Curated annotation (Swiss-Prot), chain B:
It catalyses: (S)-malate + NAD(+) = oxaloacetate + NADH + H(+). This is Malate dehydrogenase. CDD domains: MDH_glyoxysomal_mitochondrial. Belongs to the LDH/MDH superfamily. MDH type 1 family. Pfam families: Ldh_1_C (PF02866), Ldh_1_N (PF00056). The gene is mdh. PANTHER family: MALATE AND LACTATE DEHYDROGENASE, MALATE DEHYDROGENASE, MITOCHONDRIAL. Changing A291S: In strain: EC35. Catalyzes the reversible oxidation of malate to oxaloacetate. NAD(+) binds at G7, A8, A9, G10, G11, I12, G13, D34, N94, I117, T118, N119, M227.
Length: 308, 312
């Protein structure tokens, strides 16, 4: 299986590429692309790690050599911090990269990491549609960082093994759109104050990092970790492994919005089943309805960026 | 166990810290320190990873709160490259950094195992030793120059050449950590043999492998990610042995029985008190014996440079 990382020279991309180099299965191939000229050397650096994963790095404007034969494409290109100017830049980047994906490896599974995910998977979808290669089963907004933060915060609050906690997270990927299903964590229960506090902490966790970094940026290492978990799940599922389940932001039945993060059974063709979000608590139900307009705006912003 | 990383905001430090956060035994503590104000947030970043490893980040000039109760200290601080600075300039910066950070270590956690990652390792562990002696806390069994990157590079190049699985090759590497002081013991690699031309070419590839990264990065950077992977292998081996695991062997640059130089890299059995046994380098080929003898002047100059730096 071959994985391409577009945006490989960034903080998220290097973390991701490191975890993938040492965690992909033997006989996997890893290729790195970024416009930054260090990129062939990021690959060379990683190539000195004795694992059975072939790795190569590529720069320039054309991502084609990185993309040829790619089974999974993970996109983490873009900056983090006018606010209109930076969005236009990140959106432009996703639009371009996905267009390269569409030309070279249209049957790849595509993980969009670049933020704002609510909006950027919509951009991605529209680009793939205009190329005529859009498969809704193979495009994902990578929301996995929401899940692993949730697992961490629950484990610390409830004194649990952090690796034994797995919290479902549905909705979208920013602020009020992030909905952790704390009522569904097996063997743990929460107070209403705890639900309100945990939920707000999860929804604002990116700001927590930004603030402690004192202008040195947003989450990079946890995000590379999150994205690795997700890419390795897609890989496992593509190789035929069963019961691989991840939450991710995908185009589904449209009950809440056109794109929505829900539990997914993953398979040989990407999404094998969009699973039910199950029973919500009153607090969760209210949180779902209170966010829907926000998420629909995020989506529309992405559709308009492409279609004018 | 508690592990402190000094230089935690650089490329190597962040790669190291990320790897340690996931790979340290459950119940471990991880502190990060770097002068750069980002550092507390690099830790907050990492803290969102659901492993049983508590992590906290620290900045300013005082490494003390990172250092309190530390069992292992890994020093990756320093610069590989800097505008307007030449090799000699870069050396004075890195040596100053190490001298400072080791003084802080000697004050707060003098019984920690100490891993020097900052280059040049041949010189900077000698600086470290001189610092710790001045403080009255030098433990010869607890100071190591981290040479692991030479080993994993050698494992990589040998596996590729001889059609072996990369995870299956383990090349001994002795001596020091740069240029001709790096000696891979290719004569001691199982199943296979090498032609003289192969030893010559592999040895040189191993001695200059960092240049290879610098060049591929268009001179825009150095090896960071593979160095972080190498330092994590080292630091994890140290942690296992300090926790009481047996049969933990690593090559590292340490003060020993100065048969070759005062500091020298060789197979080490690791134990609960740092170095448990400095093991024999074994039987050398003719090429190897010659290479060893020929590196020794350089190695000794590298070491004396360290002592000069501290003791004016």
């Amino acid at each position: 299986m071959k994985v391409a990382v577009l945006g490989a020279a960034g903080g998220i991309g290097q973390a991701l590429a490191l975890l993938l180099k040492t965690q992909l299965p033997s006989g996997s191939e890893l290729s790195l692309y970024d416009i930054a000229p260090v990129t062939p050397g990021v690959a060379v650096d990683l190539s000195h790690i004795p694992t059975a994963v072939k790795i190569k790095g590529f720069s320039g404007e054309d991502a084609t050599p990185a993309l040829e034969g790619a089974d999974v494409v993970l996109i983490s290109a873009g900056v983090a911090r006018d606010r209109s100017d930076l969005f236009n830049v990140n959106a432009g980047i996703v639009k371009n990269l996905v267009q390269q994906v569409a030309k070279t490896c249209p049957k790849a599974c595509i993980g969009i990491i670049t933020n704002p995910v609510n909006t950027t998977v919509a951009i991605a979808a529209e680009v793939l549609k205009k190329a005529g290669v859009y498969d809704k089963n193979k495009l994902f907004g990578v929301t996995t960082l929401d899940i692993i933060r949730s697992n961490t915060f629950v484990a610390e609050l409830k004194g649990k093994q952090p690796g034994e906690v797995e919290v479902p997270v549905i909705g979208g990927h920013s602020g009020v759109t992030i909905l952790p299903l704390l009522s569904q964590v097996p063997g743990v229960s929460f107070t209403e104050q705890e639900v309100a506090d945990l939920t707000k902490r999860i929804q604002n966790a990116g700001t927590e990092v930004v603030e402690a970094k004192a202008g040195g940026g947003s989450a990079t290492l946890s995000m590379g970790q999150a994205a690795a978990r997700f890419g390795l799940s897609l890989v496992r599922a593509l190789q035929g492994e069963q019961g691989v389940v991840e939450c991710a932001y995908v185009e589904g039945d449209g009950q809440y919005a056109r794109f929505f993060s829900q539990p997914l059974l993953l398979g040989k063709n990407g999404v094998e089943e969009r699973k039910s979000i199950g029973t919500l608590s009153a607090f969760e139900q209210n949180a779902l309805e209170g966010m829907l307009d926000t998420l629909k705006k995020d989506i529309a912003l992405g559709e308009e960026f492409v279609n004018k």
